[PDB]
Design a protein around this ligand. Structure first.
Ligand SMILES: [Cl-]
Length: 290
């Protein structure tokens, strides 16, 4: 009876997890009524941005490699908060997935289905243990590439999220898993001076450094970015399809652009910086302490 459920879903802004940083796990499911199981090594990040007065954004990013082939995906969600003229609360979902090997593939698909989040869902974690989690249903933005090859082997289109413990941003030096000066993002420098937060992001290809100011906080700290006038964000060939998407958004960005930053610890007790630019074609910067 999904159509009836979606009909009600439309009448209220989309239910999302509390604003913050999440771990995402791509799941497999065997049947429309079977319990989804997380898939090894198909983990990612998800970010729910704070609720706007008009819109709430969120995103999910996943990077996976097999052989010499990378498959990178981002899902970008926009949930309207105010009502539409038909009394509806629009939801928009976009998947961009790129497959980079000897050949190249990009698949981008939007869908405006409303009932795409599920709260307290049973999920078989990586140990075979059933647990409960928010679940995204990204089935309608597709799971295959055009040659009938699946984007991620076993992926059902369902995505579990788990809240990550985030520290506040400290004064430190970071690196977006990079490096010559040809990459999209390079050094990232953060200063936390008694709560006042400044973040400097070098964009080596664009030839500029963006600087953001904000206030330190547990979870997401809101930044206002400047520096865009000094940058050349163009469509490359040196960039991946998704990077060119990020470039297209950054080329239209202007001073006082909003971003959110937080830190957390990954596996080997190694801290990571995450900066997310809402409504910027999925721009997500992750950086290792250095
Ligand atoms: Cl489900």
């Amino acid at each position: 009876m999904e159509k009836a459920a979606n009909s009600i879903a439309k009448r209220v802004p989309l239910a999302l997890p509390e604003a913050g940083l999440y771990q995402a796990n791509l799941m497999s499911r065997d049947g429309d009524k079977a319990t989804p199981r997380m898939i090894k090594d198909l983990d990612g990040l998800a970010l729910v941005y704070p609720k706007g007065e008009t819109v709430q954004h969120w995103g999910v990013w996943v990077d996976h490699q097999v052989g010499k082939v990378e498959t990178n995906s981002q899902w970008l969600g926009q949930a309207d908060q105010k009502a539409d003229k038909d009394g509806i609360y629009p939801v928009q979902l976009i998947r961009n997935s790129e497959r980079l090997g000897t050949s190249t593939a990009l698949s981008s698909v939007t869908n405006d289905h409303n009932l795409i989040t599920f709260q307290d869902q049973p999920v078989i974690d990586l140990q075979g243990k059933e647990i409960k989690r928010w679940v995204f249903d990204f089935t309608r933005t597709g799971t295959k590439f055009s040659d009938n090859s699946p984007i991620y082997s076993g992926f059902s289109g369902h995505v579990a999220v788990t809240a990550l413990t985030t520290k506040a941003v400290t004064t430190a030096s970071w690196s977006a898993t990079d490096s010559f000066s040809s990459e999209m993002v390079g050094k990232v420098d953060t200063t936390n001076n008694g709560g006042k937060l400044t973040v400097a992001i070098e964009f080596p290809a664009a030839g500029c450094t963006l600087v953001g100011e904000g206030s330190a906080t547990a979870g997401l700290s809101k930044l206002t970015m400047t520096g865009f006038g000094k940058c050349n964000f163009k469509q490359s060939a040196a960039a991946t399809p998704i990077e060119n998407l990020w470039n297209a958004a950054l080329a239209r960005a202007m001073d006082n652009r909003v971003a959110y930053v937080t830190t957390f610890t990954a596996d080997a007790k190694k801290e990571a910086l995450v900066i997310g630019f809402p409504d910027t074609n999925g721009l997500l910067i992750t950086a290792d302490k250095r």
